[PDB]
């Protein structure tokens, strides 16, 4: 049992989770990402990926937990904030969704994709709506 | 809402 | 004439370049990016986009020059190195392409996409093919 | 590699 062998085992489980996501087997994906975390619990990507699978099943509270874990483990991994913002937005918490999406743009700057800006703008519009009435 | 692919 | 109006003018030219790229009118795209740079010459994105238009015409020496300008203006804008890596790869300079593509991975770290790693692995396979002749 | 989409 080496650090390299442990990492390779967890990475293989992550890959099985990614394949499940592509097949829209979100229930299987949650299993594989969970199993990967149990092998290697210090890798933020596995938590962000599980957040995506949870969100795909509309389990936004579970998604938020995993996104916050990703953010805690690696605050520079911006997909953590993307997952948090998507789940907060879906829960009707646009102010926290806006803060998460803005963090993505703060990290990426001029590197930000069009999708990242759109997510930020959608949350921003929703926060504006909540004030007009 | 953008549904982002896993990594 | 406000700074935002100048930026909006350059961005509209950039968008005209993006439309030209979509239509595969690469000569027109080069013009629009050039005009954007003349309106606002401090934005590395215009140079990186012009490098893409040059590369599409297989003008890789011109692409390298624009990619290097993008990198000088904005060293953390990783698409400048992606443009440099492509141009060098296409020139048959795969060690220099590998260094460019590796710099993208160093900037992005655990945020790197599968496309970025595919580019890196492609340059690496060409470097290794070369030293195995 | 490919010339990725501009911007
Ligand atoms: Zn051992
Ligand atoms: Zn199943
Ligand atoms: Zn299992
Ligand atoms: Zn980044
Ligand atoms: Zn920048
Ligand atoms: Zn024309
Ligand atoms: Zn013109
Ligand atoms: Zn020989
Ligand atoms: Zn290629």
Residue numbers in the entry:
A (entry chain B), C (entry chain A): 93 to 225
B (entry chain C), D (entry chain D): 1 to 7
Give verbatim lines from the article.
The yeast ortholog of SGTA, Sgt2, is best understood in the context of post-translational insertion of tail-anchored (TA) proteins into the ER membrane. Sgt2 captures TA substrates after they are released from the ribosome and passes them on to the Get3 ATPase, the central targeting complex, in a process mediated by the Get4/Get5 heterodimeric scaffolding complex. Sgt2 contains an N-terminal dimerization domain, followed by the conserved, central TPR domain and a glutamine rich region toward the C-terminus. Importantly for its role, Sgt2 associates with several heat-shock proteins such as Hsp104, Hsc82 (yeast ortholog of Hsp90), and Ssa1/Ssa2 (yeast orthologs of Hsp70), which can bind directly to its central TPR domain.
Two copies of the TPR domain were present in the asymmetric unit due to non-crystallographic symmetry. All Sgt2_TPR residues could be built into electron density maps in chain A and chain B. The two peptides (chains C and D) were partially occupied and were built with care. The interaction between the Sgt2_TPR and the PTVEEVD peptide from Ssa1 is mostly driven by the formation of a two-carboxylate clamp. Most of the electrostatic interactions between the TPR domain and the peptide occur in the C-terminal EEVD region and anchor the peptide in place. In the interface between chain A and D direct backbone contacts involve hydrogen bond formation between the carboxamide sidechains of Asn141 and Asn110 in Sgt2_TPR, and the sidechain and backbone of the terminal Asp7 of the Ssa1 peptide. The guanidinium group of Arg171 forms a salt-bridge with the carbonyl main chain of Asp7 and forms an additional internal contact with Tyr169. The Arg175 sidechain interacts with the carbonyl main chain of Glu4 and Glu5 of the peptide. Phe178 and Tyr181 contribute to creating hydrophobic pockets and interact with the aliphatic part of the Pro1, Thr2, and Val3 residues. Comparing the two copies of the TPR-bound peptide indicates that, in the interface between chains B and C, the main difference is in the backbone of the N-terminal of peptide C. This is manifested through small variations in the orientation of Pro1, Thr2 and Val3 sidechains, changing hydrophobic interactions (particularly between Val3 and Phe178 of the TPR), and new electrostatic interactions between Thr2 and Asp211. It likely relates to the fact that the TPR domain helices suffer a subtle contraction to enclose the peptide in the TPR groove. The crystallographic structures we have obtained clearly show a slightly more compact conformation of the TPR where helices 1 and 7 are closer to each other in the complex structure than in the unbound TPR (See Figure S8 for a structural alignment).
